[PDB]
Amino acid sequence: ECISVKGRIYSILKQIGSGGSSKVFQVLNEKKQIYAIKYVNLEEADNQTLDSYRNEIAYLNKLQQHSDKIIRLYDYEITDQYIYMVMECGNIDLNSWLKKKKSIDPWERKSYWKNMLEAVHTIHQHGIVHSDLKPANFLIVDGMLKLIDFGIANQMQPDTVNYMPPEAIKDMSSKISPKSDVWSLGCILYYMTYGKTPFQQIINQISKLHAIIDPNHEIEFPDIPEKDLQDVLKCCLKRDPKQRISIPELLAHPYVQIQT
Numbered sequence: 231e232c233i234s235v236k237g238r239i240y241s242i243l244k245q246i247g248s249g250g251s252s253k254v255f256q257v258l259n260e261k262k263q264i265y266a267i268k269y270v271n272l273e274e275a276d277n278q279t280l281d282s283y284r285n286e287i288a289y290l291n292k293l294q295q296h297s298d299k300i301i302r303l304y305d306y307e308i309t310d311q312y313i314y315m316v317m318e319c320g321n322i323d324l325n326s327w328l329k330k331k332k333s334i335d336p337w338e339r340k341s342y343w344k345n346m347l348e349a350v351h352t353i354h355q356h357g358i359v360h361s362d363l364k365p366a367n368f369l370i371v372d373g374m375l376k377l378i379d380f381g382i383a384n385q386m387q388p389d390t391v392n393y394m395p396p397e398a399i400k401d402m403s404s405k406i407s408p409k410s411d412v413w414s415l416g417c418i419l420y421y422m423t424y425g426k427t428p429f430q431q432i433i434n435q436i437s438k439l440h441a442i443i444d445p446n447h448e449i450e451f452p453d454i455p456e457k458d459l460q461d462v463l464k465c466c467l468k469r470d471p472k473q474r475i476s477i478p479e480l481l482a483h484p485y486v487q488i489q490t
């Protein structure tokens with residue numbers, strides 16, 4: 231099949247992702263340059279969904295300039311029937327790359343952590359809190375991690391509640407701040423370090439949600455060479471968000487600033 235966007239015509243290689251009424255395709259332009267196109271079918275979309283898609287496109291647009299750790303938006307086309315967004319294609323999403331690697335170079339993990347903090351910090355500066363970060367939200371391209379979305383519109387999945395923060399659960403029934411994203415980033419780094427998510431081994435959602443909120447449930451951190459890392463994990467995974475480390479701090483931390 232093919233897709234046209236503002237004139238230009240693109241050929242579908244395959245479908246790399248899917249969600250409610252939308253699909254992401256890997257595609258090629260005329261000069262055989264590769265891109266990711268998101269297609270949103272708006273035909274039965276409520277005004278809230280409509281507005282959330284409008285808000286994503288606008289934020290994606292504005293944030294272009296502020297970091298190259300945010301996915302590139304080259305062009306889009308929006309009508310009443312559909313959206314098409316032409317964006318950069320990556321090598322692999324971080325959630326897939328994590329299941330395949332299964333022992334991560336410490337240098338690559340540290341570099342990737344910086345990439346994530348910078349992307350997320352960037353959206354925090356424009357008043358966004360993602361609130362649902364997980365490794366699927368990040369994408370490897372060149373040698374760096376880019377943020378794919380902002381938690382604004384429907385989440386897509388590649389063709390998952392380990393990462394939820396305590397404030398969000400105790401929220402019911404706002405306590406959501408930028409710290410909420412630190413928690414989820416905490417969990418992602420934990421996974422890249424210990425090879426699992428802090429509350430992964432717990433068995434059935436409903437119990438795990440109590441654990442996540444329960445102070446007495448001591449979260450455990452095996453000792454490891456890198457103590458900068460160990461400290462980062464501890465600081466991100468504090469349950470009281472007022473005492474949780476912030477992203478500006480994280481960026482000032484030896485784990486990020488100091489190599490070897």
Ligand SMILES: Cc1cc(-c2cnn3c(NCCN4CCOCC4)cc(Oc4ccccc4)nc23)ccc1C(=O)NC1CC1
Nearest residue numbers: 246247266268318319320321322323366378379386387388
């Ligand atoms: C959802 C989305 C996805 C990409 C994208 C761009 N490349 N890419 C890739 N890379 C290629 C992976 N593969 C395929 C087979 O092997 C060879 C290479 C995977 C992927 O997997 C996914 C798929 C879904 C969810 C997460 C991750 N999503 C994307 C860019 C933007 C958006 C998006 O709508 N953002 C919102 C507007 C703000």
